Every structure is written in structure tokens, then in C-alpha cells.
Design a protein around this nucleic acid. Structure first.
Lengths: 96, 203, 154, 98, 80, 126
RNA sequence: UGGAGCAUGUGGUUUAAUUCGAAGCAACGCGAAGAACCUUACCUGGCCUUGACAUGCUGAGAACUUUCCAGAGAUGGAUUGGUGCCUUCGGGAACUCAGACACAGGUGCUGCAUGGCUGUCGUCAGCUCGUGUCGUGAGAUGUUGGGUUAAGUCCCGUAACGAGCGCAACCCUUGUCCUUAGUUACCAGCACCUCGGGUGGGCACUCUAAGGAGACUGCCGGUGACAAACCGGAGGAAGGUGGGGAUGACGUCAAGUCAUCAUGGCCCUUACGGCCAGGGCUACACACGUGCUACAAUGGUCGGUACAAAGGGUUGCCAAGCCGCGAGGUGGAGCUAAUCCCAUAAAACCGAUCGUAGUCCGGAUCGCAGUCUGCAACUCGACUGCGUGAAGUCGGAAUCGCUAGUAAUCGUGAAUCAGAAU
């Protein structure tokens, strides 16, 4: 189970719905392994009339998470794979 | 520096919550632009308070947050499917349409901002209903409304900073949630963008 | 205009164990790298006493015995002409020009090796017949007209 | 001008009007196994086959507004957009932190 | 850059009224619509007047030429 | 035993203290102190606490630090010399403050502000 | 700063066609936050009579192929095929282009009847208001005084009492504490190894923290009206103040665009609706906004150290390259990156022989000439091989400018998915 999604508050609250949801069905899903902040620095110019001093600053992230089903039989990671998404998560899975 | 971009987080949420690749980060940022300009220049009636363009499993999700359900929903949804065709063709992906309710609508910024500039074309005084912009919209709910009005105001070179304070608005804030709706219009001569600081309670 | 400045020099080393030459690595590491400066920083210590008989500090301790002026020259005016004020200051003030002035005036000599250049006049601090003990007594001499400049109109 | 954005946007089709004889005859060019008698058939490739064939004459702007600066590798949008977009919410993922 | 990788100048929309001029006698020029209308090094002894917009220039094509564009006959900056 | 986890840091580290009683034996980066460090003046500067506390004959020291450069982590051997030792006892407890070797400093290269050139260094003007 | 090492940075220079921009050491951050087929700042070859495009009335033939032909140069037309399309078997449609009325084009003028979420405060807590009082009034008081502070945080007094707007708290925001943490990294437990770790196990002698107690007016002693403050103190390898400002707290100097969305007193109106444009901006005659590099001595010319190295990467980055002195174009392991393509590196050891110099630091017009974008490098390009053609002398008149991690010399990885942003 390798993932590709948005932020610090919708993939961690969707891999709450992966470990327990496929552990109750008989097999075992290991714990969530940390993968930190994506550190990407940007530059703009925010002045109405042009003022190279008057910049601003931005940043954007992508979280991944490493889970691994020990003996691969969990269909919940693929059947309830749309349960992992609510509005804007597009789930990547890896069966094994 | 602009805050509402700071409280993308501890206060509020987003409107375009869809995941794609990093190269595909622009591919659904095509069609987030032909539908949002349609609700303003056509649906001045049933005023929109927020446009969320979500892309869930296999179609889309755009919720036109109106304040008038009887005009949009008419005779078992005859005008509901009208917005299905004029939008989803120019937009890339089709949309399934669901309509919610914003009962007690007198506390939101966009729901009032489209109801100020439309009265200023009919040769109405620019200082009477702006007091009753706060006197008629503060009886139940929120705690205060500051209004900066700098602008045009019937004459040519006016820099008058009107100060419609009745209550409390703090504007350095993140917990004290600021809303800000500057919709523009053109009256009998000149441009009017109505500046709005409606402010509900904290927590 | 209260002074919130706090002075505290670190005086201890794993090589020399000195006092006013231990933490001196600042002007001998000439904006570059310590690897090249390490043989120039503490390479001169055992180069000033390697040409003489006494230890490095022997003629390094006697630098403030003939290179420290007995007055001050900070200007001030009251309603006429600017008058400076010269008087016995604290050791620190007087003993600041008794090393750095003797040290920095070694670029107008420059013999073989950069470390010898730094050590060029470190052994001069005893007899004081160099250039650092030429401006020491000079300072005293320019205070005849400034002699009575301290109390009245100063 | 009503006809400045209209006279250059149409190169999405015209530059790629053949696009296959151009795709086949821009890969063998990096191969010297072509003979010296073949220094002329590699030069009956693409040009007077009408000259909307050079890709050197195309340029981007904003999606609604039309501006060449401020374009990053993640949008179709510009720098006077990005202050007015995420503050109403048009830009995903763009939060403010360290 | 600009090494001698692209050796021969075979360009059929720019070839077909310069190389064909061998059979016809020299009483008329080759008429140019570029700042960059180069031709083959087999055709030294012709006339190429640099297209830029209002009058043509004296181009004395002599026996020894190998290198670059025609930006020296009618120069880039013309000292107006 | 004494088979414990200390640390020592300067300029973005995460260290390894493989320490025990011994006789002042000092080591770093799967090597000794006189392998990567040497022919430089910060060597005996960490012996200045090691002479303060007479611990040059009573402990065997393996503290590892990496990152930064050559000599910017001279202070990181300095950082956790008694971080493996005030865990062992409180014998040198109220006698170590005069040394002054633990302060993870913030006089560093933090965020880089726009408009200026560097840390708090300013551009050229009149 | 300096006779001076002659950059469009505006004022003095060279046309045969020339459109607006600041008004000080706030004059190279003055329309727009980019002039690659001109449907742009009337050179314009050039032609309009309906139309790419915005537009109603009408069409063969829907369409394209319109490769190729004049073209050293858009396209009409040969256009090689297609008849397309729903069928109450009536009727209908879009378009390479095309004919008649009107037009879109301001592509000159002009911030003085039209900018909104600033191009100038040193970071001043300073500028105001409601009511009350005093004055015939304009006003004033509040906001003065005594003390204190970066600071209307204040405190004590007072015809004022409140308030609008603050660092604090809502704005660089978790070594410091952490449940749980590394399916392919590698070697603390280890055997191993080529001691580069193949590989279990590495959650414990650990591998890049999402986010969470975090740092104080907290106490003691005096000084101060003891009161706002101001000095001295612990813990203990860290205990008292460390504003990090795009809807400035708001108050500031007839002045940049009838111009990025806007917005007027005259204009083209067979036209700046036509477009394939037959070339006409640096004579040096200088000042100047001057802002790295040194003064020959730490001396003059190499291929080498313990040694940077991860991501973006379905028309991309382009190995150890055979090519090499130095060129990693036919190859291609990283092809969706806990690999890698720029994959090489780091001022050090005692760096050769001769020991301290406007030169054995110096090459502007004469790099000719070399299987790489590809229908398009005929007297100019990186391609640094050093035979040659120089000028760097204590910085004085007086002036940019420094109270603490500060005055202070090792590079950017990535596209509208084809690798010279000082």
C-alpha cells in the first residue's frame, strides 16, 4: 500500500480507514510509517504597480504512506477503496 | 498579508478538492473557470454564497449555494436540468447536481453583497440602506458589522471613508472569522464594488 | 541612552592556554578557511620564540608595557571650540592599542612566510624600538593644550 | 484587440496539422546511419509542406485573462490570478505555513 | 554552437530558382525575401540583396566565401 | 550496564553515544578522535571540560557526529560530553554551568527573508 | 569615487518613414505582472467592396486531402477519394471561401469634471471621534501634568468619561515531550561483506515530525508614591523583555494609464477591415547613480585529496560513454525515482627549480575550421590549446556606511512536458 494524495488532514484521516478496516476482516495491516512535509519554495510579485521588493511566498505538499498487508487477501483495500475517498483523495493502492 | 489564505486550515476549508498528478495539476484547473462566471452574470437571482468545485468518483460536484429554492426548483425540477446542459459541456466533465438550504440567510457575506449594489442603480441615496444593511441584518445571529466604504458616492473625486460601525469586527484575526465579499456593479455613472465585512461569532 | 552591552571574552585553549591570544582567531582566519589558517594562526606562536631564547609569551606579555597611551582623545564642544578629554582610563581602554596596533602594522614589511609576517613584530614588545612604541609616547605629547581639558568647559 | 488572442490560439491544430510525418521525421535525424545519398531525402521532410510546421512560433498566456509572466509549471493561470484564486479557493493544496 | 553537422544546403522551397539559373544567362538577379537567404557554396558569383524593406544594397560576391549570414552586406545597424 | 543512548548536535545532526567506563578514550565516525580531527586548534577545546571534571581516565567515549562540513561540528563533540554523564550521576551536577557547552544555538541561518540579502544582513544604499 | 579598464541607465552624438511614459542625493521598482508571421505603436510591398474573426439575408459542395504549381513568398484553384445527416420519407443544419446594408480595429490625444484591496514615517502610538464641560465664537479639553516605556501596555494625579483602531493573544509559530513509527535504505543487536553491506532483523545502544505541555511579571531583596517601572537572583552544561506587516491601527508631499476590468472634448471611417511589408535607431564629442575583482610577490601553467549527489520527469531529464588534453551527438543501467541524467566535486598536508617585479597575472579588430535542433549557420558564436597586441602604487578633497552571529569570497534540480534567468 503506497499512496499519493493531498495534505496533512485527509490522507491521515483516510489511512485511519485502511488499517483497522482490513484488520477486522481477518488479515493484518501494519502501522502507518511517517513520510514528512514536502518542502518546495516559491516566489511571486504581489504589488499593484510593479515593485520587485513587494513579493510574497508560497508552498505546496504531497503526502505518501507505506502500509503493507502481510498475507495478501484483504479485499477491503480494493473494495472499500472508494470508502477511503470522500471528496478529493485519489487513492493509490499496492496489494502486498 | 491576506489571511483567509492563512486559515486554509484552522478555520475554513477549500473549494477545489480534487487529486490528480503534479503534471495533471493543471488538467482539472482548466474547467474551474467557465462555470464560476456563469452563476454571477446569470444567477443574480438565488444568490450564490460559495462555489465548491469538487471532483468525486466519476463525474463532479458543484453546489450552487443559493438562497431561493423556489426559482431553481420549479415543477419537479425543470430548471435544475437546465444548468446541467449549459455548464457541463463547456466544463470538461459532467456534474451531478444537488441543492442544499441556507435558511436564515441574513448572516453571510455574498448573500448580502449582491443585495446592495443592485439597489444603487435606481437613484437611491447611498447612505440610508447602508445603515439598514446592518440594522436589518443584525437582529438574530452575528455580533457586529464594520463597513469601510471608500469609493465614488455620487461625485467625481471623493475619497470619503464611510465608517458604518454598529457592533464589533476585528480584522487581524484567524479565530474571529472574517468574511469579505467585494462584488462589483455599474450604476448610472461609475463603478460600485460593495465592500462587505459581515462577522459572525467566534467558535 | 543606557548601555545594555555585555562584555565577556572566552580565555582558554587546548593548544596555548593563554589569556588575550586564545580566542584571537578572527583576524588570522582571513575570511576563508581554517585548514589553511590553522598553520598560520598558531604557527606563528612557535616562530617568535623559535628565533630567540625566551618563550613566545615572554615577549608577548610585555606588549602592554610600552604600547599603551595614558590618555584619551574623544571630542566634545560647549559653546566655542571642540575640546577632547584625556585622563587615566581603565586598563581595557588603554591596553587595546598595545597589541592590535603592533599586529596590524606588519603588512608594510612582509618577509618570507605569512606566519612570520604575523609574528614580525611580536618579539619587539620588550625593548619597544619598533613602530608600535613610536606612537605610544606620541599620544602623550599631544596633550599640552589639552592638559586642562576635563573639568572647565569639558 | 478582439483578434489578437484569436489569431494565435488556432495553432493548437495548425502546428500539429500533419504531426505524424513530423513525428516520424524528427527521430532518425539523431542517427548518422543514414547515408550521404540520403542527405537529400532527410531534407524533403517538412517545410513547404505548408509552413505551419515549426514549433518555434507558439506562446502561452493565462487561461481566462491572457498574461505571459507568472505562469508556473502547474497551471494555465497567472500571477494576478493566484492572489485572487486561492483566497476564494480556486487553487488546491496551496496553504500558508513555514 | 553552429558546427558543421548540417553540411549541404538542400532546401527545395529555397533551391528552385537559384540552382536552376545555371542554364539561363546572367542578366538578372536572384530576388530575396529574407534576412537569411543563404545559398549553396557552389553558387559564388551571384547577387543576393538583403531583404529588409525599402532599398537594395551593393553586394560584391567575390571568389572566396565560406562562413555565415548576409548581415554584413546590408548591416544590422546601418548608421542612419 | 552503561549501554545507553545519549546525543551531541551542532548543525543538523542525530548522534550516537556508545559510551562506558574506560580511560578517556575518544572516538568518532567509526574512527578515533585523531582520525578525522587533527592538525587543528579545536582538539583540546573539548579537553577543557575533560580536564575540568578529571574524566580523562574514567570513561570510554564514542560520540559520533556527521553533517555540515569539517569543523562546524567541533562544538558537537563539545555538545554531549556530559550528556552521557549527568545521566550516570549528579556528582558534577552543580559544577558544570561554568563550562557552557550545551546551548543549541539559534544564531544561525534560519528562514531567508526577501528584500534583504542574507540572515539579517542588509543590501547597499545611502 | 580618482588623466581613467568608451554598457543605449536618462541628458550632449549618426536618419531619406518618430507613438506615450519621472519632474529632488524618492530622475536606470515612472502604461502591462514578456512587439516570434505584423487582423501595432500611418515607410508599408499591397489590395478591399460581406468577411478569418463579432454580426443578420444567400450557396455549389458539409467537412478535409488542399501534399503539390507559379512562390527566390499567404493562398485561390489541379485538390487525386468521401457525400456526408436525422428520416411523420415533408424538412433541416455547420463551413476552405464567397456576394449587398452595417461594422468590429483607437493600432494617436489625454489621470486635472473617472483608479479600487500604497510607487515616500525614522517603525510615531502617534492621528481622531461619541457624550459631557468651558468659550459669543473659530476652538479647546480629552490627547495636559508627575513618573516610566520600543511603544495612548501603561501607572499616579486631573472637567472629563468612554472609544475607534496594537507587539501581546489571530498570523516565522513543537531539540525541547511523543503514543506508534521505515514492504526494496543498510549493519548500534549481529553472523556476514568486496568492512561498497548481498540480506533477514534494524520499533531498543534508532532512519528527514504531522502535530501536542513550550519560555514567565514567574517569585525573593532593596530603590521608585511602591506603582507603572528600573537594577540583582535562581533552576542549572536554557532563564527575564529576541513587532518575521499583500483588505499599513490611521494620519501623511496640484504631480505615472481617459491603458492589463475600466474610463471623456476631437479623430480613421475604399480605414491602423487589405496584408505575401521594396530598410532608413551605438559618428564618440563626454560628463555622469559612483555599488566584486587589487596593488606582482605568498612567487608565476596542472589531469589528482578523508570528499556534493535527490526529485519534476507517457512528444522528458539525455550514465560508467567507445568519442577525451577537455569534448559523455549512434549508447542508454534511474523510464514514473528511500535508485539516478548535469553524477565530477570540497580553501589542508611540507605543493616542484629560481625565494619579495606595472612583468615568465596581460592576447579586444586577424578562431580559420571541425559525421549534433533539422527540407532553412555562402567575408560574425560557446567550443577557454595560451604563439600574443598594455595600462592593478597605501586610496588624500570628503563621502555609500557597523554595537552580535552581526561589517565577511565553494552551486540553483525541474518547462506552454525539445537541458546558455549574473
Amino acid at each position: 500500500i503506497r499512496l499519493k494524495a493531498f495534505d496533512h488532514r485527509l490522507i491521515d484521516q483516510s489511512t485511519q480507514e485502511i488499517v483497522e478496516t482490513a484488520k477486522r476482516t481477518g488479515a493484518q495491516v501494519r502501522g502507518p510509517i511517517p513520510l514528512p512535509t514536502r518542502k518546495e519554495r516559491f516566489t511571486v510579485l504581489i504589488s499593484p504597480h510593479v515593485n520587485k521588493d513587494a513579493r510574497d511566498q508560497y508552498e505546496i505538499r504531497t503526502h505518501k504512506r507505506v502500509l503493507d498487508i502481510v498475507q495478501p487477501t484483504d479485499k477491503t483495500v480494493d473494495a472499500l477503496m472508494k470508502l477511503d475517498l470522500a471528496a478529493g483523495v485519489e487513492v493509490q493502492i499496492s496489494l502486498g | 498579508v491576506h489571511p483567509n489564505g492563512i486559515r486554509l486550515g484552522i478555520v475554513k476549508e477549500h473549494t477545489s478538492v480534487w487529486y490528480a498528478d503534479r503534471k495533471n495539476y493543471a488538467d482539472y484547473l482548466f474547467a474551474d473557470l467557465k462555470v464560476r462566471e456563469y452563476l454571477q452574470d446569470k444567477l443574480k437571482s438565488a444568490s450564490v454564497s460559495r462555489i465548491d468545485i469538487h471532483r468525486p468518483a466519476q463525474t463532479a460536484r458543484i453546489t450552487i449555494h443559493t438562497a431561493r429554492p423556489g426559482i431553481v426548483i420549479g415543477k419537479k425540477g425543470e430548471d435544475v436540468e437546465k444548468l446541467r446542459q449549459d455548464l457541463t459541456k463547456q466544463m470538461g466533465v459532467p456534474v451531478h447536481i444537488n441543492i442544499e438550504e441556507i435558511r436564515k440567510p441574513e448572516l453571510d457575506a455574498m448573500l448580502v453583497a449582491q443585495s446592495v449594489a443592485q439597489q444603487l442603480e435606481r437613484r437611491v441615496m447611498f447612505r440610508r440602506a447602508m445603515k439598514r444593511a446592518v440594522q436589518n441584518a443584525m437582529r438574530i445571529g452575528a455580533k457586529g458589522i464594520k463597513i469601510q466604504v471608500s469609493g465614488r458616492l455620487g461625485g467625481a473625486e471623493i475619497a470619503r471613508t464611510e465608517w458604518y460601525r454598529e457592533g464589533r469586527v476585528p480584522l487581524h484575526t484567524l479565530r474571529a472569522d472574517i468574511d469579505y465579499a467585494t462584488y462589483e456593479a455599474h450604476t448610472t455613472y461609475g463603478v460600485i464594488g460593495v465592500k462587505v465585512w459581515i462577522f459572525k461569532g467566534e467558535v | 541612552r543606557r548601555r545594555v552591552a555585555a562584555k565577556r571574552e572566552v580565555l582558554a585553549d587546548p593548544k596555548y592556554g593563554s589569556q588575550i591570544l586564545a580566542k584571537f582567531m578572527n583576524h588570522v582566519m582571513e575570511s576563508g578557511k581554517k585548514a589553511v589558517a590553522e598553520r598560520i594562526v598558531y604557527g606563528a606562536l612557535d616562530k617568535v620564540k623559535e628565533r630567540g631564547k625566551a618563550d613566545p609569551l615572554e615577549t608577548f606579555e610585555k606588549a602592554l608595557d610600552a604600547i599603551a597611551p595614558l590618555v584619551e582623545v574623544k571630542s566634545r564642544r560647549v559653546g566655542g571650540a571642540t575640546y577632547q578629554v584625556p585622563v587615566e582610563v581603565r586598563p581595557s581602554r588603554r591596553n587595546a592599542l598595545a597589541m592590535r596596533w603592533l599586529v596590524d602594522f606588519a603588512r608594510k614589511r612582509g618577509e618570507k612566510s605569512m606566519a612570520l609576517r604575523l609574528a614580525g613584530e611580536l618579539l619587539d614588545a620588550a625593548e619597544g624600538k619598533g613602530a608600535a612604541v613610536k606612537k605610544r609616547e606620541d599620544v602623550h605629547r599631544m596633550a599640552e593644550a589639552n592638559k586642562a581639558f576635563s573639568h572647565y568647559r569639558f | 484587440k478582439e483578434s489578437m488572442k484569436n489569431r494565435e490560439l488556432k495553432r493548437q491544430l495548425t502546428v500539429a496539422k500533419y504531426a505524424k510525418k513530423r513525428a516520424e521525421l524528427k527521430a532518425i535525424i539523431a542517427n548518422p546511419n543514414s547515408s550521404a545519398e540520403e542527405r537529400w531525402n532527410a531534407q524533403v521532410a517538412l517545410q513547404k509542406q505548408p509552413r505551419d510546421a515549426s514549433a518555434s512560433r507558439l506562446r502561452n498566456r493565462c487561461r481566462l485573462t491572457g498574461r505571459p509572466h507568472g505562469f508556473y509549471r502547474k497551471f494555465g493561470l497567472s500571477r494576478n490570478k493566484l492572489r485572487e484564486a486561492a483566497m476564494r479557493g480556486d487553487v488546491p493544496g496551496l496553504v500558508k505555513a513555514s | 554552437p553552429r558546427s558543421l553537422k548540417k553540411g549541404p544546403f538542400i532546401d527545395l522551397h529555397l533551391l528552385k530558382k537559384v540552382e536552376v539559373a545555371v542554364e539561363k544567362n546572367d542578366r538578372k538577379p536572384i530576388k530575396t525575401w529574407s534576412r537569411r537567404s543563404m545559398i549553396l557554396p557552389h553558387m559564388v558569383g551571384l547577387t543576393i540583396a538583403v531583404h529588409n524593406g525599402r532599398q537594395h544594397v551593393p553586394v560584391l560576391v567575390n571568389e572566396d566565401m565560406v562562413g555565415h549570414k548576409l548581415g554584413e552586406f546590408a548591416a544590422t545597424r546601418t548608421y542612419r | 550496564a552503561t549501554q545507553n543512548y545519549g546525543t551531541g548536535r551542532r548543525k543538523t545532526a542525530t548522534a550516537r553515544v556508545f559510551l562506558r567506563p574506560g580511560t578517556g578514550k575518544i572516538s568518532i565516525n567509526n574512527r578515533g578522535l585523531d582520525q578525522f580531527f587533527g592538525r587543528e586548534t579545536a582538539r583540546m577545546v573539548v579537553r577543557q571540560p575533560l580536564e575540568l571534571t578529571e574524566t580523562v581516565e574514567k570513561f570510554d567515549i564514542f560520540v559520533t557526529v556527521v553533517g555540515g562540513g569539517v569543523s562546524g561540528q567541533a562544538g558537537a563533540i563539545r555538545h554531549g560530553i556530559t550528556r552521557a554523564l549527568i545521566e550516570y550521576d549528579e556528582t558534577l551536577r552543580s559544577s558544570l554551568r561554568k563550562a557552557g557547552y550545551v546551548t543549541r544555538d539559534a544564531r544561525e541561518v534560519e528562514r531567508k527573508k526577501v528584500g534583504l540579502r542574507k540572515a539579517r544582513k542588509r543590501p547597499q544604499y545611502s
